[PDB]
Amino acid sequence: SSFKAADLQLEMTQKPHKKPGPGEPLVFGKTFTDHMLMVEWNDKGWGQPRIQPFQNLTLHPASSSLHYSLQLFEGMKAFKGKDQQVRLFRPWLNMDRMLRSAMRLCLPSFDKLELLECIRRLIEVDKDWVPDAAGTSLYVRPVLIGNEPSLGVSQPRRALLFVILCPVGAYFPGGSVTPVSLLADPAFIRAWVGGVGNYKLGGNYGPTVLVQQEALKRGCEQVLWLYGPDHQLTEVGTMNIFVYWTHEDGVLELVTPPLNGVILPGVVRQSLLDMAQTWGEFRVVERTITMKQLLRALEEGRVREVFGSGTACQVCPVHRILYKDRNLHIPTMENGPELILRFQKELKEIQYGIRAHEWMFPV
């Protein structure tokens, strides 16, 4: 059924593009690498995978990817250490999530490890594009779209899988943690139980653009997505949320919302849970967090740190939440931020190859 890496076609570029410098401030995903991966699917099966020069897609105007959002994507980073070795961070989890997303949209199944090997081969070809400066990396963007020339809402009989790469600079200006303010208004819903918010589908993102603009108009940087009558904290923009506090039972704990359907199962999210569990210094749980619980904890001075997690930012500190038109200062930066700095340090040691780990996949 699946495409094989052993069947890979190679077409090197004879028109190389200008590489960005470590000194020039880069915007997220605007400058791309020399090559891309492309695999075509039809009802008879997958075609042969190919590494070809970066080029535009040729799509039929009726392609189901453009009309009925038969599209999904992934996002992972490749890191270059001082010894020039490029490594991907827990890519197996991204491949797992990509296949789950594909099944939800009735898009073709593929072998997760064959796609991983094809992606490894692609990054190997564009190795010189992976930067080595502090906090920089190569963003990998796999995409699977429906491509049937039909206006009928049905299972695609044609599909296209492609992977593009882009060098990204340091998220924080310089190399120090800067906090974000969040708008928490229950009128905005990102996902729902029985919905598709737990899959990385394009459809979950388009509607967020206007809401993010509303957050900016109200003086906030990101949106704190609330869910249900009890105003459950779900996500911070397009990042998973973590709260480090002394809970109502008097125990020091790190909590993040559980995977009940409205939470996207983040790779960094899973890594922070795994890392903190291994330390065994405090309680680490997956449990629902409500605004009522957070309000009470803040007034009682029990909150230490609140942060967002994702591939783009790793660990993003939160200093303010605007809920029901009331400002809530989150003492994250006044508490170090001890845990965020510890997570940042240990993730960078694993990611840049200072410490050898099972989480890293060598390219």
Ligand X SMILES: *Cc1c(COP(=O)(O)O)cnc(C)c1O
CA distance 210 to 11: 41
Stretch that binds ligand GBN, among 86-94, 160-168, 289-297, 309-317 (CB under 6 A): 309-317
Of 191 and 276, CB closest to its own copies: 191
Radius of gyration of the chain (CA): 21
CA distance 315 to 241: 10
Least distance (Å) between residue 141 CB and ligand GBN: 8
The residue with its CB nearest to ligand X is 266
Q: Which does 113 bind (CB under 5 to 8 A by kind): ligand X, its own copies, ligand GBN, none?
A: none
User: For tokens 């930066």, what's the residue?
Assistant: 333
CB 79 within 8 A of CB 60: no
Burial class (CB in 10 A: 0-12, 13-18, 19+), 133: middle
> Residue 42: CB partners within 8 Å, gap ≥ 6?
157, 158
From candidates 114, 148, 235, 305, binder to ligand X by CB under 6 A: 235
Least distance (Å) between residue 236 CB and ligand X: 8
CA distance 178 to 31: 25
CA distance 221 to 218: 9
Q: Is position 350 an interface residue for ligand X (rule: CB under 6 A)?
A: no
Q: Scan residues 68-127 and list those touching its own copies (CB under 8 A).
A: 68-71, 73, 103-106
Q: Which does 313 bind (CB under 5 to 8 A by kind): ligand GBN, ligand X, its own copies, none?
A: ligand GBN
CA distance 201 to 60: 21
CB 97 within 8 A of CB 75: no
Which residues does residue 315 pair with via DSSP β-bridges, in sequence order?
309
Q: Is position 311 an interface residue for ligand X (rule: CB under 6 A)?
A: yes
User: For tokens 């790190």, what's the residue?
Assistant: 254
Of 238 and 332, CB closest to ligand GBN: 238
Q: Which does 149 bind (CB under 5 to 8 A by kind): ligand GBN, ligand X, its own copies, none?
A: its own copies
CB 269 within 8 A of CB 256: yes
CB 87 within 8 A of CB 353: yes
Residue among 170, 309, 317, 137 at smallest CA distance from 238: 309
Q: Is position 332 an interface residue for its own copies (rule: CB under 8 A)?
A: no
Least distance (Å) between residue 272 CB and ligand GBN: 13
Q: Scan residues 171-190 and list those touching its own copies (CB under 8 A).
A: 186-189
Annotated binding site: 139
Annotated binding site for substrate: 139
Chain positions contacting its own copies, by CB under 8 A: 27-30, 32, 36, 54-63, 65-71, 73, 103-106, 139, 141, 143, 145-146, 149-155, 162, 164, 166, 186-189, 192-196, 201-210, 212-213, 238
Chain positions contacting ligand X, by CB under 6 A: 75, 200, 235, 238-240, 264, 266-269, 309-311
Chain positions contacting ligand GBN, by CB under 6 A: 75, 153, 237-239, 310-313
